[PDB]
């Protein structure tokens, strides 16, 4: 969908820092390209699940729009592979007929192997292929308003190959929110539901404990449907309560001496 | 596939799993006017997880003879990962067999092999056995939220299985499945060993207090050694005490490893 | 085929 | 470990405590032992493993072990946590004859010294007594007999015959079918024929191996011969004609 | 130190020589109220954010500070109980000064003790640091002093002070201020001098009101003496700085 | 997380990572695993009852003892464990005489628990603020009764966790739950002693592993004319005798 | 194999010496030994030297060694390839060292030709008396390179460098001269060898003010010498945020202030001797 | 998810300055019941109900006299509270034979605090786990205050915590500024500081035994209004 730049919270501080990144890769090549300075092809970054790290990757192409395909490397794990390997490299000449489009890689290399050695599995053909389609690239400051790139769960765990940190570094771990921020990410989560507003989330926004931002959609979805477990056309809003210890169930089976 | 043919009285057990997956069944089929006020169409497709045998597969089966449901069996690894020709011509054929077939539901089991694992980009790989994964993905989101079926999938492990489909709009739930208490081990005996030549006015509680943590399957086999030995005495019925020395056999005559 | 099974590898 | 708690406090999930179960898990790989108590005397016995006929036979530290001349003690498995047990039991029978001026009952004893195992199990920086015993004697003045039975997780249990350690259950089989609450033996050498026969399993007609004490009124202790033990060992055995 | 490594338990130098089990505390500080240390010309005076988290609090109720024997004036930050308890070691062991050497107790040797205290639960390995980062200034025959504390003990001397989760925007006027006045003020204009700071910190947390509390101490106000202000005063100054802030 | 127990559990005075410390659940369970109890409330006495595992045929079990007094107008039970149990009753009787010493009345019961319930608290913290005696807690869910002046026919469930509970009726052991229930629809409030002592007999001859006689269950009584005792075996013989005919249909 | 042959990418590609500062006489101690053979091979022989055979580096990383380690090529015209010693490892034991062997005839079969070799600690162990089921693998793998060369397989003509950030831990063995002649150390530079490498990159962009460096490399204590071409894009970075896309050495400042506590919060970790 | 480390005991801090350990004491209490209260200018009050185990069962003691200046409740683990207790009638014991000039209530809590501190540093030893409500009246007149084991004591007019409390404090902070502007009765606060308590629950019957109150002002000793007599007050 189209939805807006935001759709997640008042982080204003990375969003409208981080494209300031790729406004050189957007445009501004009058004295960028005449400065001929450094210019980051594909801002792959970090922090682990639980973020909307696909949805400011995905919203910041609400203004430079992008086709909805973006496959990932267990598109590229496979019998005899590298006609796989043969997509990728040929992904970015094709859409470099003409369009802004960018698609997202997502990598999570060693969740399939061990690390006992820090002499690690970088992955057979990403490593290759990460390299030709980065290294023989430009964005020309029109029809190429990004640049593609992925990201990963932990920047610990790499053999970082030529020029995969030559350029390619701008990378920030998005900062978990504060009270201020979670109610009104919740807040987000029932615009298309309605409850009995007695308790709002500025309430909540002191119980809060531990939450990142993902499973928190796991909140509403469930507790809109405590309420209508209990078929109230009037959505309650204290069946937050005990739906969100629901998270992994407490085993709560009869407290017997507290 | 139009008639499973078993109850609530046939299930003993925890039992408690049927009411929340007596939501999603119904009210998407029957009534979401208790929730159209409220976000309608508010469930759209889960998913259910549990040790081996624990009545997952029996639960859901427990109700497809229920709302005359209609359900399939091409189950699994068994029919469409070993006899392969474009799975997916199937999965096509499929909803084309299902485009517009009413009070039916999708259900398949073995999935730690077909789509849990992505070969971890080794064991030779294979393709086809995604393709027709992803071609579902295709035909999932076709019309299941404005339409009416629904969707149920099974694992032994459900973090054993794959993640990466977890998109929600595409997935809902996922409900756990364990042992029962000794209640849900009383009502078991009155289905199990009932069919068996016994005698009656029988205590079948006892057993439950000293057969601790333990699945329901095998307790047919706890029937099927004890109506062992009457035989073994050239007598005829049994006894109650025959699974006591039938329980001493079985239990701390197994937890040796 | 022309071929069958045999291997060798490391565990970690 | 002052304190520390280390896995003698950690209950299980089961219920269980590891470290005691594993304790009389352990006492059994050691020598045998027997108890009985008839009409009017009561008898023990155990075992001596075959050495190289060097173990010294004289002064050998045995199994029996007086406190008084009306009690003794036998026991099993671990010898070196035995030999306080026996010594602070005795001390509180001198006190006990003391500051009472009275001798010791029985009852008094088997809950001491039951009692003082779980100290040594609940309580801090302390391992418990892998080892478990009986009691055997009468009271005095009483032609009563008694013996009991404790073991390291501090509970007693009173019997009739009983039997600890190695290959028990290969044996204790043979006394609840031959003795029985029914009716005793009627004296000393009925209980004997008895007692030694249902040993002879686990025995390999070794008649020096095993050692042999009895009990009777007025605190008539003794240890017997091995001569009127292996005369006993033979005849019995003349009775196998079949 | 990350995992597999040294930051967990107290006493175990990771081996660029440091206790990470001490700088997650000043942390902890960091995620606490506000509050100041300022040297007068003549004195101190402190401050704090009291923090309204409802409704049914009182005014004037529940402080956030305490006091040393007579003169002595202490405040708190991050943690309350940990800053309440050695407190009580405050006011403990000034009377064994006091009933010794038959005098009030001077600052300089003050810290000596409680400088110490908190160091010596910073050795072992059984034990936690105090989660504080502490302000205690008075006056004596020899002027008038101001010293922050730090866990670790790095106590130093300062003229004007900071902590909580508004410092580099509150000390910021504390320095952008006294270059202003090398004179160094008196006690009753430095009141609404910093009671600038804490309407103005607080725009990091505007989904909530608050209030504050003020300390007192000088030789022309108090004979030197700690105490709080009310009535116009501080009326005047809250009114004031929040008058010259529009 | 994935291991909330394991990685939790060895530490004995560690809260749970949701709030229920452990060490006290691991001894609240073992009382199941040893052999059951029961007693009721009534105002003409106090009925209590026990199994007693007669495991071979020659424990004189007559010798066994799941039950005991405290003084002559108290008597307890007993569950679970039993080693652990003689310290508590060592410690509780020593409150009564001497509390029929300081004061030189008789002692009330709810004054006595409150001082045997705070016992089983001495590891992690303390009572009255010391520190510390003994390493790890202890499983016997004991099940005292007695008579008394303010509130006459009493008895209390206690626990090691330390809480306890004023019942009317309450079994142990694993048989607990599969009685519990039988009793609560048949438990009146104006009932006698003899046919409770009839009713007790209906779970034991219900729950029990094996057939019932003198020697798998006893019992013991209260009233304020006698105060405690028990019941030898034929009167344990005669009870069950007559109990039949209640049952011929 | 085919992965042999998809390694070797810009073998011969100038980016000459004119580019790089603060290294004017580890340079003079390595264009002495290696282009001279491979120059004027004779003098070795008019004179009765075993020539050379091995070099390397040594130092803190991103300090500009891998520049060196391709600015020789500028000078030679001459072949090259880029390896690392990380890449290597797989399931299969051997096929990991067997590569080994395919390579260095792959230079034989064609040269002037030398070889350059990252990261070798992953390579560098002592060997051990103790193991695990594995980590023997690597030290079977390694010694192969160990011989070749130097092995009873005689060598000439061809060249390589290897490099780490942790010289310890090597087997001495490896150290033997003959296996490599010659040593050095990289280090982060004084001010001036600072200096030359923060105006390189003035030197291609439009620089527009006075010099404005002495105090400016005042700060310079600190930095590696990678951070600059960082710091140097960073102050356009944000000179023209403001839509002003002419610089300055006004904004500079705010950047190279600002890197130096950005890495510090990370930094110095480490030395390596 | 995935396990953490740093809560094996109570003396590391969390990287990022939790005492990981403390909050999971402070689980329990919303995990456990409800014991609420307000403040009057002359009167104030405790109000808690009952829980059970089954029907054949009494129900738990939950409100607990210290001297008749003060009491107070509690809300979670009931061992903690007789220590608390049990050590708290010998202060306003010890203040009433030494000075004779009865204790306050506020420098309670400020000892108290201090106890929990002490006991939340050291190894050997544990927190104890409980949040309980308290009252008083001295000279300056009545009070109500609130603990947690941090040793954060905050006086307050009242204040709610259990589970399904949310919606009684939030009835409390709607409804302000009416139930304290009286005095000299007793017995209409509670009638509100009832239904405050008719937030979220079930009750449904007559709620007779399942709760308990005792009240104190500047005339009234502290004694707890149970059984049959609390029946009007509902
Ligand atoms: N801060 C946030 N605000 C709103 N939604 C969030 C936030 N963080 C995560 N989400 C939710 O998580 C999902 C997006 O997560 P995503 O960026 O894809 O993380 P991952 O790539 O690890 O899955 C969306 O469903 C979104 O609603
Ligand atoms: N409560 C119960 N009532 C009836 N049958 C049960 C119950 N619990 C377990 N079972 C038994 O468990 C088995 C479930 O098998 P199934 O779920 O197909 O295996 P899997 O879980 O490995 O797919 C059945 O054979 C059934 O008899
Ligand atoms: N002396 C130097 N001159 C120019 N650039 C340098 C220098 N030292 C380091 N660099 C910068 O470091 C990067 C790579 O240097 P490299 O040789 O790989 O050092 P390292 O091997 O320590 O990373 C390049 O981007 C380069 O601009």
Not at chain 5, 100 to 121: S, W
Not at chain 7, 69 to 81: L, P, R
Not at chain 8, 191 to 208: H, P
Request: glycine share 8%; with cysteine.
């Amino acid at each position: 969908p189209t939805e807006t730049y935001s759709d997640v919270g008042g982080l204003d501080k990375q969003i409208e820092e981080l494209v300031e990144a790729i406004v050189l890769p957007m445009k501004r090549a009058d004295k960028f390209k005449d400065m001929g300075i450094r210019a980051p092809k594909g801002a792959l970054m970090y922090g682990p699940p639980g973020t909307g790290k696909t949805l400011l990757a995905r919203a910041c192409a609400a203004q430079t729009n992008a086709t909805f395909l973006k496959l990932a490397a267990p598109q590229l794990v496979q019998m005899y592979i590298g006609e796989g390997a043969k997509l990728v490299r040929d992904a970015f000449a094709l859409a470099k007929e003409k369009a802004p489009t960018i698609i997202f890689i997502d990598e999570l290399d060693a969740i399939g192997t061990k690390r006992f050695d820090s002499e690690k599995s970088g992955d057979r053909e990403v490593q290759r292929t990460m390299l030709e389609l980065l290294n023989q690239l430009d964005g020309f400051s029109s029809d190429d308003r990004v640049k593609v790139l992925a990201a990963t769960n932990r920047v610990d765990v790499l053999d970082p190959a030529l020029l995969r940190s030559g350029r390619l570094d701008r990378k920030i771990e998005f900062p978990l929110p504060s009270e201020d921020s979670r109610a009104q990410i919740l807040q987000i989560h029932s615009r298309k539901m309605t409850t009995d507003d007695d308790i709002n989330w500025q309430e909540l926004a002191r119980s809060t404990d531990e939450f990142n931002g993902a499973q928190l959609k796991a909140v509403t979805v469930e507790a809109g449907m405590i309420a209508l477990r209990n078929g109230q056309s009037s959505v309650k809003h204290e069946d937050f309560v005990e739906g969100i210890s629901e998270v992994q169930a407490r085993k709560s089976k009869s407290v017997s001496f507290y | 596939e139009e008639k499973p043919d078993v109850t609530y009285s046939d299930v003993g057990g925890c039992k408690d799993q049927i009411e929340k997956l007596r939501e999603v069944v119904e009210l998407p089929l029957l009534s979401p006017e208790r929730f159209a006020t409220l976000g309608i169409d508010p469930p759209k497709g889960i998913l259910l997880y549990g040790p081996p045998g624990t009545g997952k597969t029996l639960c859901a089966r427990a109700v497809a003879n229920r709302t005359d449901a209609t359900f399939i069996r091409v189950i699994g690894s068994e029919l469409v990962q070993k006899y392969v020709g474009e799975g997916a011509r199937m999965v096509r054929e499929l909803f084309e067999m299902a485009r517009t077939k009413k009070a039916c539901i999708i259900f398949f089991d073995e999935i730690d092999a077909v789509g849990g694992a992505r070969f971890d980009d080794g064991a030779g790989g294979d393709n086809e056995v995604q393709r027709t994964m992803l071609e579902l993905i295709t035909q999932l989101d076709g019309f299941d939220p404005r339409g009416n079926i629904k969707v149920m999938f099974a694992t032994n492990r459900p973090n054993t299985l794959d993640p990466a489909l977890l998109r929600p709009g595409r997935i809902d739930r996922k409900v756990e499945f364990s042992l029962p208490d000794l209640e849900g081990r009383a009502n078991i005996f009155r289905i199990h060993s009932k069919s068996m030549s016994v005698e009656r006015g029988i205590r079948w509680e006892l057993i439950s207090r000293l057969c601790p943590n333990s699945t329901g399957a095998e307790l047919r086999s706890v029937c099927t050694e004890a109506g062992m030995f009457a035989i073994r005495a050239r007598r005829k019925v049994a006894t109650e005490k025959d699974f006591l020395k039938a329980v001493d056999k079985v239990i701390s005559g197994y937890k040796k490893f | 085929s022309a071929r069958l099974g045999g291997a060798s590898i490391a565990v970690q | 470990m002052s304190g520390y708690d280390r896995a003698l406090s950690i209950f299980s999930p089961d219920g269980h405590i590891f470290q005691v179960e594993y304790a009389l898990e352990a006492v059994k790989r050691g020598t045998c032992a027997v108890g009985v108590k008839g009409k009017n005397c009561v008898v023990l016995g155990c075992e001596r493993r075959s050495t190289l006929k060097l173990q010294d036979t004289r002064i050998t530290p045995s199994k029996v072990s007086k406190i008084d001349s009306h009690v003794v003690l036998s026991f099993s498995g671990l010898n070196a946590d035995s030999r306080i047990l026996i010594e602070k039991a005795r001390v509180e029978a001198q006190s006990h004859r003391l500051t009472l001026e009275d001798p010791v009952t029985v009852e008094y004893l088997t809950r001491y010294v039951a009692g003082v195992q779980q100290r040594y199990t609940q309580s801090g920086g302390v391992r418990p007594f892998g080892v478990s015993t009986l009691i055997a004697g009468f009271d005095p003045r009483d032609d009563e007999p008694k013996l009991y039975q404790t073991e390291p997780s501090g509970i007693y249990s009173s019997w009739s015959a009983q039997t600890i350690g190695r290959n028990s259950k290969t044996v204790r089989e043979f006394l609840e079918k031959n003795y029985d609450r029914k009716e005793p033996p009627a004296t000393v050498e009925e209980c004997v024929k008895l007692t030694v026969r249902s040993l002879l399993e686990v025995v390999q007609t070794g008649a020096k191996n095993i050692e042999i004490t009895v009990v009777k009124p007025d605190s008539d202790i003794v240890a017997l011969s091995s001569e009127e033990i292996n005369q006993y060992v033979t005849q019995i055995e003349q009775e196998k004609q079949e | 130190s990350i995992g597999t490594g040294y930051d967990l338990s107290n006493s175990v130098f990771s081996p660029d020589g440091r206790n990470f089990q001490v700088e997650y505390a000043v942390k902890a500080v960091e995620n606490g109220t506000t509050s100041i240390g300022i040297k007068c010309n003549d004195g101190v005076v402190f401050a704090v954010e009291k923090l309204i988290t409802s409704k049914l609090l009182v005014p004037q109720k529940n402080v956030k500070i305490q006091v040393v024997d007579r003169h002595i004036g202490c405040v708190y930050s991050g943690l309350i109980p940990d800053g309440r308890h050695l407190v009580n070691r405050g006011r403990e062991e000034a009377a064994s000064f006091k009933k010794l050497y038959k005098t009030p107790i001077p600052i300089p040797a003050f810290a000596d003790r409680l400088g110490q205290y908190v160091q010596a639960h910073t050795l072992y390995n059984s034990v936690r640091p105090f989660g504080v980062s502490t302000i205690f200034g008075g006056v004596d025959k020899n002027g008038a002093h101001l010293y922050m504390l730090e866990p670790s003990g790095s106590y130093w001397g300062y003229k004007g002070a900071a902590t909580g989760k508004g410092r580099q925007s509150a000390k910021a006027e504390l320095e952008k201020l006294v270059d202003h006045h090398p004179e160094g003020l008196s006690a009753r204009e430095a009141v609404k001098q910093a009671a600038k700071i804490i309407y103005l910190a607080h725009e990091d947390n505007k989904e909530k009101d608050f209030e504050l509390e003020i300390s007192w101490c000088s030789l022309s106000e108090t004979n030197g003496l700690h105490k709080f202000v009310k009535g116009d005063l501080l009326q005047e100054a809250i009114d004031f700085a929040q008058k010259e802030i529009n | 997380m994935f291991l909330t127990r394991s990685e939790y559990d060895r530490g004995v005075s560690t809260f749970s990572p949701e709030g229920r410390l452990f060490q006290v659940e691991y001894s609240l369970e073992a009382i199941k695993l040893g052999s059951t109890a029961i007693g009721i409330a009534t105002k003409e006495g106090v009925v209590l009852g026990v199994e007693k595992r007669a495991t071979s045929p020659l424990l004189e079990s007559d010798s066994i003892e799941k039950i005991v007094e405290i003084d002559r107008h108290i008597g307890c039970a007993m569950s679970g464990l039993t080693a652990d149990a003689r310290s508590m009753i060592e410690h509780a009787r020593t409150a009564a005489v001497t509390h029929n010493l300081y004061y030189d009345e008789d002692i009330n019961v709810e004054s006595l628990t409150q001082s045997v319930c705070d016992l089983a608290l001495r590891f992690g913290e303390g009572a009255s603020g010391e520190e510390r005696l003994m390493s790890r807690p202890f499983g016997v869910a004991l099940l005292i009764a007695g008579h008394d002046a303010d509130d006459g026919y009493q008895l209390f469930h206690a626990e090691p966790s330390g809480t306890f509970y004023r019942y009317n009726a309450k079994a142990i052991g694993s048989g607990s739950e599969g009685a519990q229930a039988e009793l609560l629809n048949e438990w009146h409030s104006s009932l006698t002693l003899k046919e409770a002592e009839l009713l007790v007999l209906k779970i034991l001859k219900q729950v029990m592993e094996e057939k019932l006689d003198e020697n798998n269950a006893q019992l013991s009584c209260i009233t304020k004319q006698d105060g405690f005792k028990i019941y030898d075996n034929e009167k344990t013989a005669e009870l069950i005798k007559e109990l039949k005919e209640k049952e011929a249909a | 194999d085919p992965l042999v042959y998809n390694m070797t990418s810009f073998e011969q590609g100038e980016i000459t010496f004119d580019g790089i500062g603060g290294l004017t006489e580890q340079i003079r101690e390595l264009r002495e030994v290696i282009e001279l053979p491979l120059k004027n091979p004779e003098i070795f022989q008019r004179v009765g030297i075993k020539p050379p055979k091995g070099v390397l580096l040594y130092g803190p990383p991103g300090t500009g060694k891998t520049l060196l380690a391709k600015a020789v090529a500028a000078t030679i015209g001459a072949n090259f390839i880029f390896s690392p010693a990380s890449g290597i490892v797989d399931k299969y034991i051997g096929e990991s060292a067997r590569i080994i062997r395919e390579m260095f005839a792959y230079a034989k079969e064609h040269e002037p030709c030398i070889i350059f070799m990252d990261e070798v600690d992953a390579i560098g162990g002592r060997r051990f008396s103790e193991g695990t089921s594995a980590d023997r693998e690597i030290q079977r793998t390694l010694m192969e390179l160990l011989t070749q060369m130097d092995g009873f397989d005689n060598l000439g003509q061809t060249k390589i460098i290897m490099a780490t950030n942790r010289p310890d831990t090597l087997d001495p063995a490896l150290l033997r001269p003959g296996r490599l002649d010659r040593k050095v150390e990289i280090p982060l530079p004084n001010e001036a060898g600072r200096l030359e490498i923060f105006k390189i990159h003035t030197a291609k962009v439009k620089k527009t003010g006075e010099f404005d460096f002495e105090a400016a490399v005042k700060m310079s204590d600190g930095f590696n010498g990678a951070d600059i071409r960082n710091c140097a894009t960073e102050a356009g970075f944000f000179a023209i945020r403001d839509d002003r896309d002419h610089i300055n050495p006004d904004d500079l400042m705010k950047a190279v202030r600002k890197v130096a506590e950005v890495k510090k919060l990370e930094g110095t970790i480490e030395y390596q001797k | 998810m995935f396990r953490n480390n740093y809560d094996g005991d109570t003396v590391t801090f969390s990287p990022t300055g939790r005492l990981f350990q403390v909050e999971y004491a402070l689980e329990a209490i919303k995990q456990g019941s409800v014991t609420v209260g307000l403040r009057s200018n002359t009167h104030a009050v405790l109000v808690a109900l009952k829980r059970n185990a089954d029907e054949l069962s009494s129900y738990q003691k939950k409100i607990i006299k210290c001297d008749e200046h003060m009491g107070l409740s509690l809300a979670g683990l009931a061992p903690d509270a007789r220590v608390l207790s049990n050590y708290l009638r010998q202060q306003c014991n010890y203040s009433s034979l030494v000075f004779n000039r009865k204790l306050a209530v506020e420098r309670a809590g400020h000892l108290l605090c201090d106890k929990a501190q002490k006991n939340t540093q050291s190894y050997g030893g544990r927190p104890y786990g409980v949040g309980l409500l308290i009252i008083g009246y001295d000279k300056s007149g009545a009070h109500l205050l609130e603990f947690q084991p941090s040793g954060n004591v905050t006086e307050l007019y009242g204040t709610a915590i259990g589970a399904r409390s949310q919606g009684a404090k939030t009835y409390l902070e709607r409804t302000l500024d009416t139930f304290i502007k009286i005095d000299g009765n007793p017995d209409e606060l509670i009638k509100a500081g009832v239904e405050a308590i008719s937030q979220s629950l079930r009750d449904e019957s007559l709620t007779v035994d399942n709760l308990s109150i005792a009240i104190v002002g500047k005339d009234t000793p502290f004694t707890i209004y149970d059984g049959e007599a609390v029946a009007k007050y509902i």
